């Protein structure tokens, strides 16, 4: 998991957020993100 040091919200944070993993959940239960489509 990548981390940017700087943050407008402050201290230090990993870049990935709740919306991305929500989209991953939606694509899994679709039955258009992939692992590669997160990588790009």
């Amino acid at each position: 998991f990548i981390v940017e040091d700087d943050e407008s919200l402050g201290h230090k944070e990993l870049k990935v957020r709740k919306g991305h993993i929500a989209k991953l959940m939606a694509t899994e239960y679709q039955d258009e993100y992939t692992w590669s489509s997160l990588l790009n």
Binding site: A22, M25, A26, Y29
Partner: peptide, 20 residues
């Protein structure tokens, strides 16, 4: 505390259906 011994998934899928 809740301490999360167990977790739910589709209830949250539904919560994001209302959120989006």
């Amino acid at each position: 505390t809740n301490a999360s011994p167990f977790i739910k998934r589709d209830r949250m899928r539904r919560n994001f259906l209302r959120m989006r």
